[PDB]
Amino acid sequence: SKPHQWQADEEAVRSATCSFSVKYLGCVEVFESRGMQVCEEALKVLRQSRRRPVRGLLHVSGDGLRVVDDETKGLIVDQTIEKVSFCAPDRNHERGFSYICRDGTTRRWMCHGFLACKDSGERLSHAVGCAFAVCLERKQRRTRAAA
């Protein structure tokens, strides 16, 4: 909400200690878990399937997204942000997003989906979008040529 509270959360992730409400759909099986095109379709799968969405808050602290419901109070995606395959917002066409984890401790290429609670690309998009910032703040990511 412009300079005020948004300035706080933007810094929270920097120090690893943020959070935002959301309805984390669930998890699905995939043959990639390392891209963006898989997230766009993965989310769709979370629906067609029986992956009922939770009603809690995503514990984002620039280290590992730990989504937890507000009913059962149980961790769903207990994975590290540095180890996980990272997130990739669908297409910001309706405030939709989706994570991804290369097996690790989730069996196999497990695709994830979570639609922002407030729904306004101003709670999870910029929140988790920075969550990784702390991971590769110096853009350690090796995707381009670099120099």
Partner: peptide, 7 residues
Amino acid sequence: AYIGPYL
């Protein structure tokens, strides 16, 4: 986007 959908 930023880091995820790119880096």
